[PDB]
């Protein structure tokens, strides 16, 4: 009856702790991306002595820049929190095992903030499709035809570019992690003493 009673003592805070905090943490990260493109003109200067009417080999490909952001969850904690069923055999669970489970839970909950920020990457691409036909100076009957067509993809180079963003790392380690670190007193009073 007394183990029954202690199970009953601990069962509501169980709902407050393992369930509510989990569902709170479930609202993290999201698959977002931003898209854009350009028809930028790329020219190659050519002297007129090169038998042309024009002087610049101008190309206007489709250059597009893709940035995708899945942002940030919790460093793939997962099963360490997905270990709920440990409350099924209260008839034999001991003080210590349940208590240590709760302590490890309180530990990983605090480690949320430091282990939160993950961010995402980005890239770019070009799609060349150009066919420039050049007359010959004073000779309309003579021509040059240059046709170019290809699509090429490049990363956004997260070293130079690829940063230059919000960086959600900030505003969160300035947050609880150091002040909610105060929870250590809670574990102090927890530890069968104080």
């Amino acid at each position: 009856s007394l183990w029954l009673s202690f199970r009953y003592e601990i069962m509501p805070l169980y709902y407050q702790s393992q369930d509510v905090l989990d569902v709170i943490a479930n609202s993290t990260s999201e698959f977002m991306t931003s898209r854009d493109f350009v028809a930028k003109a790329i020219n190659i200067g050519i002297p007129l002595e090169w038998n042309l009417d024009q002087e610049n080999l101008v190309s206007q490909p489709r250059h597009n820049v893709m940035v995708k952001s899945k942002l940030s969850p919790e460093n793939n904690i997962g099963k360490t929190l997905s270990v709920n069923p440990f409350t099924t055999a209260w008839e034999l669970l001991t003080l210590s095992f349940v208590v240590d489970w709760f302590v490890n839970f309180g530990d990983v909950i605090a480690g949320f903030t430091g282990g939160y920020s993950d961010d995402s990457g980005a890239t770019a691409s070009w799609r060349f499709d150009d066919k420039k036909v050049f007359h010959l100076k004073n000779i309309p009957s003579a021509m040059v035809i240059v046709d170019i067509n290809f699509y090429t993809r490049q990363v956004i180079d997260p070293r130079l570019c690829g940063g230059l963003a919000f960086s959600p790392k900030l505003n969160l380690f300035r947050y609880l992690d150091a002040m909610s670190l105060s929870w250590n007193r809670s574990r102090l009073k927890i530890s069968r003493a104080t």
Partner: protein
């Protein structure tokens, strides 16, 4: 006369440079929705 397609494409890849203006624009667009989501997260720490 015209240049060879080989050297033309060589000059093209040498001329291949990412659009800094587009990069800035898309980074701003990303950070917009990024802080939009971060706004919702504002009260999670207090619950924690």
């Amino acid at each position: 006369t015209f240049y060879s397609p080989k050297e033309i494409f060589n000059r093209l890849k040498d001329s291949l440079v990412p659009d800094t203006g587009l990069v800035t624009q898309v980074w701003a667009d990303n950070n917009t929705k990024r802080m939009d989501f971060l706004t919702a997260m504002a009260e999670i720490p207090q619950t924690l």
